[PDB]
Design a binder for this molecule. Structure first.
Ligand SMILES: *[C@@H]1O[C@H](CO)[C@@H](O[C@@H]2O[C@H](CO)[C@@H](O[C@@H]3O[C@H](CO[C@H]4O[C@H](CO)[C@@H](O)[C@H](O)[C@@H]4O)[C@@H](O)[C@H](O[C@H]4O[C@H](CO)[C@@H](O)[C@H](O)[C@@H]4O[C@H]4O[C@H](CO)[C@@H](O)[C@H](O)[C@@H]4O[C@H]4O[C@H](CO)[C@@H](O)[C@H](O)[C@@H]4O)[C@@H]3O)[C@H](O)[C@H]2NC(C)=O)[C@H](O)[C@H]1NC(C)=O
Ligand SMILES: *[C@@H]1O[C@H](CO)[C@@H](O[C@@H]2O[C@H](CO)[C@@H](O[C@@H]3O[C@H](CO[C@H]4O[C@H](CO)[C@@H](O)[C@H](O)[C@@H]4O)[C@@H](O)[C@H](O[C@H]4O[C@H](CO)[C@@H](O)[C@H](O)[C@@H]4O[C@H]4O[C@H](CO)[C@@H](O)[C@H](O)[C@@H]4O[C@H]4O[C@H](CO)[C@@H](O)[C@H](O)[C@@H]4O)[C@@H]3O)[C@H](O)[C@H]2NC(C)=O)[C@H](O)[C@H]1NC(C)=O
Ligand SMILES: *[C@@H]1O[C@H](CO)[C@@H](O[C@@H]2O[C@H](CO)[C@@H](O)[C@H](O)[C@H]2NC(C)=O)[C@H](O)[C@H]1NC(C)=O
Ligand code: NAG
Ligand code: NAG
Ligand code: NAG
Ligand code: NAG
Ligand code: NAG
Ligand code: NAG
Ligand code: NAG
Ligand code: NAG
Ligand code: MN
Ligand code: MN
Lengths: 399, 399
């Protein structure tokens, strides 16, 4: 009769979207994902962790979350959910399953209870929670999307496989940017077991509902938490450099006590080149031809960083506020990165202007900004192209 | 394998929660309900409307929403969706249904389509949108919650059936506040066809997630759009008064060219009576005993209002911001309402602090505020108590 029903439709925001769950220790696990944040009502607790072994019983875990993203301006906010136990709930190894009880608020009493990961009988090995690990170094790619130049990927990979050396791996996160031509440029390296391309294209369901680059670096953290002593975070338009008088290990022992440290930026124009009738720029590598560096006395610029994934719990895109140990922001003239800005989505020849010969010595001004000469990367170009041969061969060898 | 699964559970916000849907004219409809307000994402449209005729032919309307509440500070926001067609979509009276689409954002990828109302064959009556209407006056009560005094419903109901005359109807909204004691006080007026009690007790599922009173007033505005010439919004601790020399018709004809007019408040103390042994307080009505109006001047206080719902599109709790035609605020000279504030929950006797007869003529102080003797309402007590007896019989005594 006058009985007013209320009819709810749709799911404007789910409570928790689980992308990955990873064991991050004998006692502590991880669930990286997305959280809708509440409005005007609590959420104590946000989550709860269990472990249901095949023995039937169950133990409770201490559950605390972090918001290593902004935390406003998106429907969801990236959440890292920490489940630490007093005892390893499965070195019994009779099987087990990680639960997660996710609560809307403190007043209503229905919830969501699901499985985050499962461990089958006889699938555990502590020996890889301790040295040795797979690699010394592991590169964490961004969420790849857009129209991306395969030539940059070939050049970036050849360079950084040489930089990080033989015991390094590169992880990439295809969210649509890994075109067939990009693939063909990763193809040599994944054949060699040096690169991994995860398909995160199912992400299109939440595109715009959370911070895409935060979620990727939180998962790459725990999916490969013990895979390498160091885990680097930067983009394929960034190239790690070292002013001369530095080995990668000679800069690593000096930083051996710091679990995370920043890298300062060499912002390079992606258009400035030299006017030269004899330089055949269409067959020069990107960093070999863009020789002009935004060279300004101390203006705060973007960072990247590395981190001992063993000793962290969440991170951001420029550094971590979720670690144990101290950070080293003082790594300026000791390790750098070259950042060719807006070069990867550029279709065609990067050399889109031509400076006079004089620019090599004098400070030239472009787009209201000044630039200088910097052939530090140019100098390394023939070492790389030669290392490319001895590692994967020609790229007219795919490989 | 490394193909990642974005797996989502729970629902922390429906995209739309329908409370009601009504025809507001030969060509126009309104859906009243709750909406989940977006974040960062473009949402345009929020909605669109179609009419699907019984024989399969469709016709979409132009749809626009209105947000009568504040539009921030809650998981949900009150929304009135207006659908207007280029023709009566059920002209031939063959029947059909009003369909509504709710969008999550602009990618317009996923969407929610659902039936808002249905009109059975032959059911469309064009004379219900032409005078005469069912009542002259219609009252829209607020959302009733808490422990309410049945004795006040008796008194308020008696007064206002008298005040509005026979050609008026009263709509109450039961959100848990209508107790069995309150039901019996309303019962003779329900049996007399003068009062309706709607059961809105479902809104407690979403309680704390939107603005409760903003939902009731819009729904009542549209469910009764053409039931009456004037719709009055006020609470049952509030009594419309004509500073006399003014019949209600005479007042309303002076305002007939205005789509809505507001009404200023006489604040009355709910804890304050004569110290008098000749008076028999437990058997006198509230407005008969509480004779002291707060007398501070130039104090802006909440207002109430009346409205010609036929010329209004959405409303609020103190007036509408969505009408055609003008609005009148200088009504102090001929219509007011007495507000017995914090009088409706009070269990037991309202007379709780007593004053000498020197308060009839001086200015009384209590709790920092001043008060003056006002007997306009008490003068009408014996007239109401009669009127009650003549209209609903011998209600029994003692409040
Ligand atoms: C969820 O949250 C919980 C809690 O919030 C997380 O659990 C915590 O995780 C922490 C990091 O994983 C962990 O802290 C580490 O514990 C290690 C093991 O501890 C055992 O040994 C130490 C003695 O070393 C005992 O005191 C302890 O009781 C245990 O028996 C430690 O080894 C770690 O110490 C190192 O890091 C700290 C912090 O920077 C340094 O101050 C310290 O000096 C150690 O530094 C060495 O290692 C770092 C890099 O790891 C180097 O930078 C440094 O130069 C040192 O390197 C030398 O030493 C190593 C040997 O470690 C040697 O091999 C190398 O060659 C060098 O010579 C660290 O303290 C918490 O205990 C743990 N708490 C709980 C309750 O679980 C959980 O992880 C979260 N989950 C997720 C998924 O994130
Ligand atoms: C969804 O939204 C849409 C819009 O976004 C809503 O649609 C709009 O709804 C409006 C409200 O009804 C409507 O406006 C009214 O239209 C009435 C019908 O107009 C038709 O006849 C006239 C001929 O004069 C044509 O010009 C017109 O185009 C149509 O053919 C009008 O009659 C209404 O006018 C009255 O109100 C306005 C505004 O106050 C006055 O300016 C005007 O003078 C009229 O005033 C008389 O009536 C009011 C009370 O209604 C009195 O206050 C006033 O004193 C006058 O009273 C004398 O006259 C009346 C006869 O009208 C008589 O009974 C009385 O005794 C007095 O002698 C008004 O303008 C929009 O046209 C309409 N637009 C569209 C595009 O749809 C829709 O409702 C929404 N739906 C929902 C569900 O919310
Ligand atoms: C609502 O107001 C309308 C408009 O004034 C009333 O209808 C008018 O009534 C008078 C007197 O009975 C007639 O002379 C007019 O011709 C009517 N107008 C129209 C357009 O028909 C109506 O009486 C009021 N509604 C109710 C229920 O009383
Ligand atoms: C039902 C059953 O036997 N459950 C056992 C529990 O008693 C024991 O404490 C735990 C430790 O391995 O393993 C499981
Ligand atoms: C498929 C079909 O016949 N659809 C009809 C439509 O043509 C007509 O305009 C309308 C009004 O009568 O009724 C319906
Ligand atoms: C890539 O190019 C296509 C067509 O040229 C365009 O539609 C698309 O928006 C581009 N993507 C980006 C990220 O610019
Ligand atoms: C570059 O040099 C060529 C010939 O050497 C000349 O025609 C041209 O004007 C110079 N400048 C630019 C911007 O091409
Ligand atoms: C190494 O780091 C620890 C913090 O984990 C700090 O207490 C200690 O002083 C550091 N040692 C040196 C030599 O900097
Ligand atoms: C009604 O009374 C009960 C106890 O008598 C109390 O718990 C509740 O809060 C009261 N309601 C209101 C609205 O105060
Ligand atoms: C009211 O009057 C009575 C007797 O007239 C007196 O005893 C009492 O103190 C007065 N005040 C109150 C609050 O009852
Ligand atoms: C009546 O209302 C209309 C607005 O709808 C206004 O234009 C007109 O001036 C008003 N008439 C009087 C006499 O106030
Ligand atoms: Mn960049
Ligand atoms: Mn009140």
């Amino acid at each position: 009769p006058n009985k007013r029903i209320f009819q709810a439709y749709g799911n404007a925001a789910a409570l928790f979207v689980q992308m990955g769950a990873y064991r991050g220790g004998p006692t502590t696990f991880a669930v990286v994902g997305l959280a809708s944040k509440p409005i005007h009502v609590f959420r104590l607790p946000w989550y709860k962790c269990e472990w249901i072994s095949n023995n039937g019983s169950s133990i409770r875990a201490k559950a605390y979350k972090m918001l290593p993203d902004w935390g406003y301006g998106r429907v969801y906010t990236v959440v890292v959910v920490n489940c630490t136990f007093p005892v390893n709930p499965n070195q019994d190894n009779a099987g087990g399953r990680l639960m997660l009880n996710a609560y809307y608020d403190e007043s209503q009493r229905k919830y969501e209870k699901f499985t985050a990961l499962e461990e089958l009988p006889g699938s555990y090995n502590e020996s890889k929670f301790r040295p040795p690990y797979q690699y010394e170094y592991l590169y964490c790619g961004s969420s790849l999307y857009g129209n991306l130049s395969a030539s940059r990927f070939r050049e970036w990979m050849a360079y950084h496989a040489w930089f990080f050396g033989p015991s390094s791996h590169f992880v990439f996160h295809d969210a649509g940017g890994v075109s067939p031509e990009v693939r063909a440029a990763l193809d040599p390296w994944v054949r060699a077991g040096r690169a991994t391309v995860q398909d995160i294209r199912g992400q299109a369901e939440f595109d715009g509902y959370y911070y895409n680059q935060f979620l990727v670096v939180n998962d790459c953290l725990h999916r490969y938490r013990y895979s390498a002593n160091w885990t680097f975070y930067f983009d394929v338009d960034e190239y790690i450099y070292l002013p001369e008088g530095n080995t990668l290990e000679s800069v690593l022992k000096d930083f051996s006590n710091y679990t995370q440290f920043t890298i300062e930026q060499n912002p390079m124009s992606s258009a400035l080149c030299f006017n030269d009738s004899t330089q055949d720029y269409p067959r020069q590598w990107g960093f070999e031809k863009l020789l002009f560096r935004e060279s300004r006395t101390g203006i705060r610029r973007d960072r990247k960083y590395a981190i001992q994934a063993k000793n962290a719990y969440a991170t951001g895109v420029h550094m971590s506020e979720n670690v144990i140990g101290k950070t080293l922001h003082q790594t300026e003239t000791k390790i750098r990165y070259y950042h060719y800005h807006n070069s990867i989505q550029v279709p065609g020849e990067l050399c889109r202007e031509f400076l006079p010969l004089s620019a090599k010595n004098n400070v030239t001004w472009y787009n209201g900004l000044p630039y200088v000469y910097d052939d530090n990367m140019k100098k390394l170009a023939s070492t790389i192209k030669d290392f490319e041969r001895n590692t994967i061969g020609n790229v007219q060898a795919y490989s």
